[PDB]
Each structure stands twice: as structure tokens, then as C-alpha cells.
């Protein structure tokens, strides 16, 4: 997250932290996700596609820091890793960039909701706020494009939803943005999701409900002039979601 502010997991209790084991045994952060029910985290396929084996992954919930423990945190194994059958990666964009991780502890348990661990609500189908609505993004992603490291402390910032017509203008991304995607950016282009933020929540308050509007998916650099961040448009994947979660 470029710019924005530091935060803690109480702000964003559904934020999931996803890591990948190695052979040598060392563990690296992969991507964020969002806890949509006690057993299910949602995230982005492009995060997993290159190492798609479930046993490689660890999910923490309740976590405010990247590489040190947070009191009250819970650690999960990945019981099922569901990647979208229609994923594609093109010269720019990822399509159908959505993934579900079924989590279960060494104890055989899903999450237990706490002050630091809560679920976030799914939108109503095909229902999204108006362009210019201000929404929040959260992640352990880079603070600057050129950084070599990720921040140890969770961040968030606010961005505004962009109209399709605006995003699909050749000035911006053109054809690359589809109806299954949302754009969002800061008016001065000074705050944004970046590398390591993928799969995390775009949360808007539609009505009075904090609602999971998007999943951080792609964009050219970060906090860059005419280059918004692009997010999977969750309200266009409900059937995929529920079908893969009714189980």
C-alpha cells in the first residue's frame, strides 16, 4: 500500500495473511485474502497459480504484523485451494482472478471469531456503488514501488471507484478492463495497492454494511498517473462463490 496509514487487524478483522512454505522450511508471504465465513477465505488465483499445491500454504487470521506474531492470532492449513477454471493472464491483466481457500487448523477447526477475527459480508449481486465512492484497501504490500522489502505493519488507504468508461479509455487501460473488473485510484494518484497487496480486500460501505466489493488483482506499477488499481468485481462472481462454498 503506497501512502495511506498504518493500521492494525482490529480495523480489518477479516484480513487474511497468506504464506508459502519452502523445501528448506522457510516461509514467505504470498498474498492477502478475506475471511468470508469461518472456513473460507477469498483471494486471487494469480497468487497461487505457479505453486498450486494446497499443502504449500499457511493462512493467518488475527494478524497485524508480517513476520512476528500478534497476540490472539490463529494459524491454518489449507484444506482446499479452489482456483477459478476461467483464469487467464494476458500481456497486462489477469482475468477471473479469484480463489477460495478452505482453511482448517491442526486441530481440525475453522476460525473462531474474536475482537481480532471477524467475517466480511459479500455484496448483493451485480450491486456496486457509484463511481467516485470512496473505498478502503488493506495489505502488507510494498510502501513504494522501488522498495525491496514489505512493511512489517499492516496498512490501509482509501481510493475512489472509477467508472468503466473512464478506466477503458486508451489513456488508462483501454480494452484490458472488462465488466468483471473494478477500477479505483486516488485523484492525485498518490495512494494505491502495490506488489504484495494482491488478493486483499477492497471494502466499500454500501447501504450501512461493510461489504467486500473487490479483490486486489492488477495494475501497471503502483500509484502511477492514468494507471488505476484493478480489482476483481466480487458482485459478478457470487454464483461461483456460493457454488464452491455450499460444500
Amino acid at each position: 500500500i503506497i501512502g495511506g496509514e498504518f493500521t492494525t487487524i482490529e480495523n480489518q478483522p477479516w484480513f487474511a495473511a497468506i504464506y508459502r512454505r519452502h523445501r528448506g522450511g522457510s516461509v514467505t508471504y504470498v498474498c492477502g485474502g478475506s475471511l468470508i465465513s469461518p472456513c473460507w477465505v477469498i483471494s486471487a488465483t494469480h497468487c497461487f497459480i505457479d505453486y498450486p499445491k494446497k499443502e504449500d500454504y499457511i493462512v493467518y487470521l488475527g494478524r497485524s504484523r508480517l513476520n512476528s506474531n500478534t497476540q490472539g492470532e490463529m494459524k491454518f492449513e489449507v484444506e482446499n485451494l479452489i482456483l477459478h477454471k476461467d483464469y487467464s493472464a494476458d500481456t497486462l491483466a489477469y482475468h477471473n482472478d479469484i480463489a477460495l481457500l478452505k482453511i482448517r487448523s491442526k486441530e481440525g477447526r475453522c476460525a473462531q471469531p474474536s475482537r481480532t477475527i471477524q467475517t466480511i459480508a459479500l455484496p448483493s449481486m451485480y450491486n456496486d456503488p457509484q463511481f467516485g465512492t470512496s473505498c478502503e484497501i488493506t495489505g502488507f504490500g510494498k510502501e513504494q514501488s522501488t522498495d525491496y522489502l514489505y512493511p512489517e505493519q499492516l496498512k490501509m488507504t482509501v481510493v475512489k471507484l472509477i467508472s468503466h468508461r473512464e478506466c477503458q479509455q486508451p489513456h488508462y487501460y483501454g480494452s484490458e478492463v472488462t465488466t468483471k473488473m473494478l477500477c479505483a485510484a486516488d485523484p492525485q494518484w498518490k495512494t494505491d495497492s502495490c506488489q504484495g497487496d494482491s488478493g486483499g480486500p477492497l471494502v466499500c460501505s454500501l447501504q450501512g454494511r461493510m461489504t467486500l466489493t473487490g479483490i486486489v488483482s492488477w495494475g501497471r506499477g503502483c500509484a502511477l498517473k492514468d494507471k488505476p488499481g484493478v480489482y476483481t468485481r466480487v458482485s459478478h462472481f457470487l454464483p461461483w462463490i456460493r457454488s464452491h462454498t455450499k460444500e
Partner: peptide
């Protein structure tokens, strides 16, 4: 001038 998500201009 290759573009990849995330990183930079080209």
C-alpha cells in the same frame, strides 16, 4: 519495453 503488473512503468 515490457509491462508486468505491479512493479513499474516498463
Amino acid at each position: 519495453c515490457p509491462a508486468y503488473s505491479x512493479y513499474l512503468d516498463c
